[PDB]
């Protein structure tokens, strides 16, 4: 549709609780008479710049914070200025994830970290270690099962392994990220992707498995483990798989370091409904009842709102999510992050498919990222 004064349009990814957010929309409309339309288009993070200037696109856009600094660089985001009373309702470190060049450019919603999810019936004692997965897959294959399936088409899911032995995106040193110091082809990064590719070479994993195939196999009881975030928990609840959430496997003794995202709601700088957007986000979404309605649809993870997080922290699944988050790092929000994801995605896909060696896939990824900053 088209952006119009008097009504809100919200974009959020299809794997999130858009039906729950729509319930918050209905509450807002009952209170204010302002209809709220929640859409989940494909490739919404790539479309938002090409539509904000034309007058399409949303009033409010949800995504992990890593993309927002590139949006702010093009002026697509409105500066958010909550007063001290509202800022204190969210954890300080989540505000930092949406601060770009001194200005807050979004509202933090929830904190996302990948975890090892496993079938308690197929696997009462899951492995603590990547190195013991092949032997486990061999034993499960003889019973008609597999050990591990997760999305190999998005580098997000492979990055905890790559970073375990020392891979990193942009080196952070004393205040800022060094955009010319990229760490995707260093020794640790190469050792991580190499281990992944040898799982595939030895038929302990399939290069073509994406999100749906990984989810379906685990939720049907065909694979013993998957790697996913909290949004996936709802579909597992429905499947009636006795599942647990636990610490990611280690590699060469070191923990996997997932890239941590803060799901954030930015306001289109050209929105005719700036105030309504802040009103909706501050007074309806970022409340105990609002986050509850979204979380019941698809779990958010560690919510940024402290009052609601103190209740969710008692859940062992959330405790495991936080533990994996403490071992990883929070993503940078700098504009160079889109070049980083694009290039690492090619490296992972080429290496897994055999189109390239692990070494030259990561060396090519390194060259592309460094040259473009
Ligand atoms: O794989 C590259 C992308 O990784 C993350 O995207 C995550 C996102 O954080 C999460 O909420 C969503 O449900 O899953 C995707 C992975 O497909 C970064 O946030 C993106 O910017 C990257 O492009
Ligand atoms: Au957490
Ligand atoms: Cl639906
Ligand atoms: Cl502005
Ligand atoms: Cl903090
Ligand atoms: Cl800053
Ligand atoms: Cl910086
Ligand atoms: Cl090195
Ligand atoms: Cl996919
Ligand atoms: Cl961190």
Describe this structure in words.
This protein has 2 domains: 8-112 and 260-330, D-Maltodextrin-Binding Protein, domain 2, CATH 3.40.190; 115-257 and 336-371, Periplasmic binding protein-like II (D-Maltodextrin-Binding Protein, domain 2, 3-Layer(aba) Sandwich), CATH 3.40.190.10. Helices cover 43% and strands 19% of the residues. The chain is built from 16 helices and 17 strands. It has helices at residues 18-32, 44-52, 68-73, 84-87, 92-97, 133-141, 155-164, 187-201, 211-219, 233-239, 274-285, 288-297, 306-312, 316-327, 337-353, 358-371, and strands at 8-11, 36-39, 60-64, 99-100, 103-104, 107-112, 115-119, 146-148, 168-173, 176-183, 223-228, 243-246, 250-251, 254-255, 259-267, 302-303, 329-330. The strands form 5 sheets. Strands 1, 2, 3, 6, 15, 16 and 17 form a 7-stranded mixed β-sheet that branches. A 4-stranded mixed β-sheet has the order 8-11-7-12. Strand 1 (8-11), helix 1 (18-32) and strand 2 (36-39) form a beta-alpha-beta unit. Helix 7 (155-164) crosses helix 8 (187-201) and helix 15 (337-353) runs antiparallel to helix 16. The chain starts with 7 loop residues before the first strand and ends with a helix. The protein binds a molecule of 2 linked components (BGC-GLC), gold ion and chloride ion (8 copies). Residues 91-93 line the site of one chloride ion. One chloride ion binds at residues 186-187. It is classed as sugar binding protein. Keywords: Maltose Binding Protein, gold, sugar binding protein.
């Amino acid at each position: 549709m088209k952006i119009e004064e008097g009504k809100l349009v919200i974009w959020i990814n299809g794997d999130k609780g858009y039906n729950g957010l729509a319930e918050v929309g209905k509450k807002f409309e009952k209170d204010t008479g302002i209809k709220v339309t929640v859409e989940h288009p494909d490739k919404l993070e790539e479309k938002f710049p090409q539509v904000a200037a034309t007058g399409d696109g949303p009033d409010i856009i949800f995504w992990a914070h890593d993309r927002f600094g590139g949006y702010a660089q093009s002026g697509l985001l409105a500066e958010i200025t909550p007063d001290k009373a509202f800022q204190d309702k969210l954890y300080p470190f989540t505000w930092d994830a949406v601060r770009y060049n001194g200005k807050l450019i979004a509202y933090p919603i929830a904190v996302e970290a990948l975890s090892l999810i496993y079938n308690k019936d197929l696997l009462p004692n899951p492995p603590k270690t990547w190195e013991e997965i092949p032997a486990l897959d061999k034993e499960l294959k003889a019973k008609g099962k597999s050990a591990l399936m997760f999305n190999l088409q998005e580098p997000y899911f492979t990055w905890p392994l790559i970073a375990a032995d020392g891979g990193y995106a942009f080196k952070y040193e004393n205040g800022k990220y060094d955009i010319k110091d990229v760490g995707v082809d260093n020794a640790g990064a190469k050792a991580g992707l190499t281990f992944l590719v040898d799982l595939i070479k030895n038929k302990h994993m399939n290069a073509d498995t994406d999100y749906s195939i990984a989810e379906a196999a685990f939720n049907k009881g065909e694979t013993a483990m998957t790697i996913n975030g909290p949004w996936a928990w709802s579909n597992i609840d429905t499947s009636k798989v006795n599942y647990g959430v636990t610490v990611l496997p280690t590699f060469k003794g070191q923990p996997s370091k997932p890239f941590v995202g803060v799901l954030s709601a930015g306001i289109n700088a050209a929105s005719p409904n700036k105030e309504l957007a802040k009103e909706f986000l501050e007074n309806y979404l970022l409340t105990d009842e609002g986050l509850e309605a979204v979380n019941k649809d698809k779990p958010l993870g560690a919510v940024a709102l402290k009052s609601y997080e103190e209740e969710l922290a008692k859940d062992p699944r959330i405790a495991a999510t936080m533990e994996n988050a403490q071992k990883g790092e929070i993503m940078p929000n700098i504009p160079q992050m889109s070049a980083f994801w694009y290039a690492v995605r090619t490296a992972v896909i080429n290496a897994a498919s055999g189109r390239q060696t692990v070494d030259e896939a990561l060396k090519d990824a390194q060259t592309r990222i460094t040259k473009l900053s």
